[PDB]
Amino acid sequence: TTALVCDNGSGLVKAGFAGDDAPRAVFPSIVGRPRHQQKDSYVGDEAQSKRGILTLKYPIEHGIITNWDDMEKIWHHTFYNELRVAPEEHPTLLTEAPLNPKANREKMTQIMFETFNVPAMYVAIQAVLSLYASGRTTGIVLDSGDGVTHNVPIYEGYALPHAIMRLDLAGRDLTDYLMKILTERGYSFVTTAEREIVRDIKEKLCYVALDFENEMATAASSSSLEKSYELPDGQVITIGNERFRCPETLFQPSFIGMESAGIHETTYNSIMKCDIDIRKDLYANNVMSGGTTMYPGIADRMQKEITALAPSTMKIKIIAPPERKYSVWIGGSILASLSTFQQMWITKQEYDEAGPSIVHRKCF
Amino acid sequence: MSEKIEGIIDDLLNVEENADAIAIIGKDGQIVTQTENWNVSNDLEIINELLNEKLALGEKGITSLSIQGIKYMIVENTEERKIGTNITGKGHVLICPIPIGGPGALIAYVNPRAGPRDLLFNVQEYAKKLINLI
Ligand SMILES: Nc1ncnc2c1ncn2[C@@H]1O[C@H](COP(=O)(O)OP(=O)(O)OP(=O)(O)O)[C@@H](O)[C@H]1O
Ligand SMILES: C/C1=C/C(=O)O[C@@H]2C[C@@H](CC[C@H](C)/C=C\CC1)O[C@@](O)([C@@H]1CSC(=O)N1)C2
Ligand SMILES: [Ca+2]
CATH of the domain at A123: 3.30.420.40
Q: Which residues of B66-80 are buried (b: 16+ CB within 10 A; e: fewer)?
A: ebeebbbbbbbbeee
Domain boundary among A236, A263, A290: A263
By the 8 A CB rule, do B21 and B37 touch? yes
Sort A33 into a burial class: Cβ within 10 Å, 0-12 / 13-18 / 19+.
middle
Nearest CA to CA, how far is A136 from chain B (Å)? 16
State how far the Cα of A113 lies from the Cα of A121, in Å rounded to an integer: 8
Question: Are B73 and A277 within 8 A, CB to CB?
Answer: yes
- Secondary structure of residue A44 in the 3-state scheme: coil
What are the Cα distances from residue A216, in Å, to A221, A222, A240, B33? 8, 10, 9, 68
Q: Which residue has the CA at smallest separation from atom 21 of ligand 1?
A: A9
Out of B77, B117, B121, the one facing A364 most closely (by C-beta) is B117
By the 8 A CB rule, do A224 and A140 touch? no
Q: Which residue has the CA at smallest separation from atom 10 of ligand 1?
A: A291
* Amino acid in the structure at residue B119: L
By the 8 A CB rule, do A120 and A351 touch? no
Best probe residue, ligand 1, of A10, A12, A204 (max atoms within 8 Å of C-beta): A12
Same domain? For A235 and A258 the reply is yes
State how far the Cα of B110 lies from the Cα of A312, in Å rounded to an integer: 37
| Interface membership of B63 toward A (CB under 8 Å) | yes
Ligand 2 centroid distance, CA of A30 (Å): 9
Same domain? For A245 and A184 the reply is yes
Same domain? For A166 and A226 the reply is no
* Amino acid in the structure at residue B93: V
Resolution in A: 2.3
Same domain? For A118 and A257 the reply is no
Same domain? For A2 and A90 the reply is yes
For residue A150, which ligand has an atom nearest its CA? 1
Most distant CA atoms of chain A, gap in Å: 70
* Amino acid in the structure at residue A56: L
> Residue A157: left (phi > 0), alpha (psi -120 to 50), or beta?
left
Minimum-distance ligand 1 atom for the alpha carbon of A8: 21
Out of B63, B76, B85, the one facing A274 most closely (by C-beta) is B63
In A78-146, alpha helices (H): 102-114, 126-133
- DSSP letter assigned to residue A48: H
Phi, psi of B96 (to 5 degrees): -105, 110
User: Domain locations in chain B?
Assistant: 1-134
Considering only CA atoms, give the Rg of chain A: 21
By the 8 A CB rule, do A207 and A244 touch? yes
Same domain? For A204 and A150 the reply is no
By the 8 A CB rule, do A164 and A270 touch? yes
Best probe residue, ligand 2, of A146, A177, A178, A195 (max atoms within 8 Å of C-beta): A146
- DSSP letter assigned to residue A78: I
State how far the Cα of A302 lies from the Cα of A319, in Å rounded to an integer: 11
Same domain? For A106 and A203 the reply is no
Strand ranges of the sheet holding B82-85, from the earlier edge strand across to the other edge: B31-34, B19-25, B104-110, B92-98, B82-85, B70-77, B64-67
Q: Which residues of A5-23 are buried (b: 16+ CB within 10 A; e: fewer)?
A: bbbbbbbbbbbbbbeeeeb
Question: Are A274 and B74 within 8 A, CB to CB?
Answer: no
Same domain? For A35 and A67 the reply is no
By the 8 A CB rule, do A133 and A154 touch? no
3-state helix, strand, coil in chain A (%, to 5): 45, 20, 35
- In chain B the first and final C-alpha atoms are separated, in Å, by 8
Same domain? For A15 and A36 the reply is no
Phi, psi of A96 (to 5 degrees): -150, 165
- DSSP letter assigned to residue A53: G
Query: Nearest-CA residue of chain A relative to B77?
Result: A162
Question: Are B63 and A155 within 8 A, CB to CB?
Answer: no
Same domain? For A162 and A268 the reply is yes
Name the packing angle between helices A171-182 and A192-205 (round to 10°): 100
| Interface membership of B77 toward A (CB under 8 Å) | yes
By the 8 A CB rule, do B109 and B21 touch? yes
Domain boundary among A232, A263, A294: A263
State how far the Cα of A15 lies from the Cα of A330, in Å rounded to an integer: 10
Nearest residue to A174 (alpha-carbon basis) of A64, A308, A11 = A11
Q: Which residues of A258-285 are buried (b: 16+ CB within 10 A; e: fewer)?
A: eebbbbbbbbbebbebbbeebbebbbbb
Contact map slice: A 274-313 vs B, CB within 8 A: 274-275, 277-278
Same domain? For A3 and A119 the reply is yes
Same domain? For A36 and A133 the reply is no
Structure solved via: X-ray
Query: Nearest-CA residue of chain B relative to A363?
Result: B117
Q: A199: Cβ below 6 Å to ligand 1?
A: yes
Q: Which domain holds residue A74?
A: 1-27+63-127+327-363
Considering only CA atoms, give the Rg of chain B: 14
The total of structural domains in chain A comes to 4
Domain boundary among A263, A280, A305: A263
CA A223 to the chain's CA centroid: 34
Phi, psi of A203 (to 5 degrees): -65, -35
